[PDB]
Amino acid sequence: MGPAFEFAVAMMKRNSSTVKTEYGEFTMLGIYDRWAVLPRHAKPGPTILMNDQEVGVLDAKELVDKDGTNLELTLLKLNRNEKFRDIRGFLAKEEVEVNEAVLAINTSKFPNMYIPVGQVTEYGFLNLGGTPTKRMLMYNFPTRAGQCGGVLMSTGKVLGIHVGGNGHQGFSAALLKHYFN
Amino acid sequence: MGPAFEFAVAMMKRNSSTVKTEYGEFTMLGIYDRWAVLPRHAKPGPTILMNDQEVGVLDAKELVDKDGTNLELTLLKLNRNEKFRDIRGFLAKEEVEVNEAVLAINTSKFPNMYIPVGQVTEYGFLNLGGTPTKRMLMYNFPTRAGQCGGVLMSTGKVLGIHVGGNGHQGFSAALLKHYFN
Lengths: 181, 181
What we know:
Chains A, B: Interacts with RNA-directed RNA polymerase. In chain A, about 10% of the residues lie in helices and about 55% in strands.
């Protein structure tokens, strides 16, 4: 748990930002170059607020699998000169399972907050608020609204982005290496 | 940071509860026997909700120093059969300073959330919302409302209870060994 916490804190400092769309305030993880990722429900428009500063969105891709099934991630390309620290080496080729994970949230509602969620298991298929979704990771913890966009991490691993919760169970979309490039 | 996180998580699981008074929802740390502590602003009445269950308060002491100066803690004795795990050995005799602290919050607004706040320094005197207060510990982090009652910890140390914030600076009341007994 401790090493996952130390990893998470470092990763958030280097790669995370707080973002506002017309649909809410979200934690945003920058991945490489000007590409970042948001939970699909963030529904980013032509401009976003990133750390309170207006930023143009050049492109947004709502990820689906080979059979059109929702993955609940949106990738976005930002109109900005600074490049994200390349973290693609921390992204797995397939859904990660770990014994000890932390979920990191960074918004106005949850400024630099970290939650131990314990074991992460590949859940896979889920009907997510009425939408069939795949590649879900599941973990047990008391889930609250505003946590959407949180970054799920263990030591040396970025596993996914928190996209939903129900009572005492949360779900992340797996953040896979091949989604980038 | 990691060891402080692991310590905090263990301590919260064993000794913390979520409490509602007429004045709000607070994280509550149980100390020994049936004695617990709340930020003074919790203003506990004759009954509290502790983990959603009504609990009678036998006694509440609003702590002041030898010259009547506010310390911003209330100690409360609970009408309940279960005894808290005695954590008085984790309480210092005097205001603690550390290089790496975590603030742990456990309420509906912030369920099992942990914040790295870095360095804790003895601030001492503070005019706290119009009230002269002493024995304050200070740390820098983006403070939000609802964090009152959070438990400030480092590895093997319970330092104090979060009682206030202003922008990017928070304050805890030092939780001293002699307050108990």
